[PDB]
């Protein structure tokens with residue numbers, strides 16, 4: 001309940017315009033993808049979520065492993081994020097997390113399961129998005 | 141439950157390393173901020189979430205207004221995202237959304253309330269993160 005870091009960003013043109021952090025470390029153009037009738041020459045909120053979750057979940061694995069005294073060199077995570085209508089006048093995201101750890105399958109599953117309890121992105125979406133988690137190419 | 145757009149991104153070094161989308165529209169370096177013992181010269185998952193939510197929530201406002209036949213020129217949203225320990229061995233995000241609409245306060249509140257039901261980012265986190273929403277400088 002203490003806060004170790006916080007940041008702000010501002011957008012005023014939704015999905016078709018600029019967005020930036022207050023400190024300007026991230027300054028981006030956004031556009032609709034071709035799939036949504038746009039040019040596809042700029043990024044979008046689904047890509048931002050995919051990048052953030054891939055990094056944050058990879059980090060969760062690294063964190064849980066370090067605390068368990070398990071030495072990892074890398075923890076590749078591919079996050080796949082989709083958007084579609086929810087049938088209630090809005091939209092919902094779908095998320096798949098494909099995690100990879102250079103350990104035996106069960107040990108890898110145990111680490112990923114704990115990472116999925118620790119990670120703030122997983123905590124944020126639990127119960128709303130049914131995140132589909134894979135470990136080393138198999139289902140969690 | 142149909143999907144209109146999906147995308148993937150991959151990270152293998154957590155919060156201290158590169159992350160990219162499959163199509164390379166977003167390719168980023170990440171580092172811990174100074175607040176977390178890092179250089180502060182690269183971005184992070186909290187900033188990615190703040191940028192994504194600011195844009196997606198601004199877009200929700202624009203979408204709900206268009207559907208209500210309310211003409212808006214812009215819809216500034218500042219998303220403030222924090223991270224801290226959750227006391228259960230992991231971390232949680234805090235989110236504040238400061239929305240702005242050039243309409244009377246109550247009309248603006250009504251539009252924002254509906255946007256907060258429609259937006260896929262709001263749908264993703266509802267019940268887990270108590271998003272603190274403001275409209276035109278006042279509480280929602």
Ligand SMILES: [Zn+2]
Nearest residue numbers: 033034035040
């Ligand atoms: Zn595309």
Ligand SMILES: [Zn+2]
Nearest residue numbers: 056057060119
């Ligand atoms: Zn994480």
Ligand SMILES: [Zn+2]
Nearest residue numbers: 059062063064
């Ligand atoms: Zn850590």
Ligand SMILES: [Zn+2]
Nearest residue numbers: 073074075102
């Ligand atoms: Zn490897």
Ligand SMILES: [Zn+2]
Nearest residue numbers: 098100136137
């Ligand atoms: Zn894989």
Ligand SMILES: [Zn+2]
Nearest residue numbers: 109113139140
């Ligand atoms: Zn399992």
Ligand SMILES: [Zn+2]
Nearest residue numbers: 173174175180
């Ligand atoms: Zn800082």
Ligand SMILES: [Zn+2]
Nearest residue numbers: 196197200259
């Ligand atoms: Zn949205």
Ligand SMILES: [Zn+2]
Nearest residue numbers: 199202203204
């Ligand atoms: Zn729309």
Ligand SMILES: [Zn+2]
Nearest residue numbers: 213214215242
């Ligand atoms: Zn204005």
Ligand SMILES: [Zn+2]
Nearest residue numbers: 238240276277
């Ligand atoms: Zn304000």
Ligand SMILES: [Zn+2]
Nearest residue numbers: 249253279280
């Ligand atoms: Zn109110």
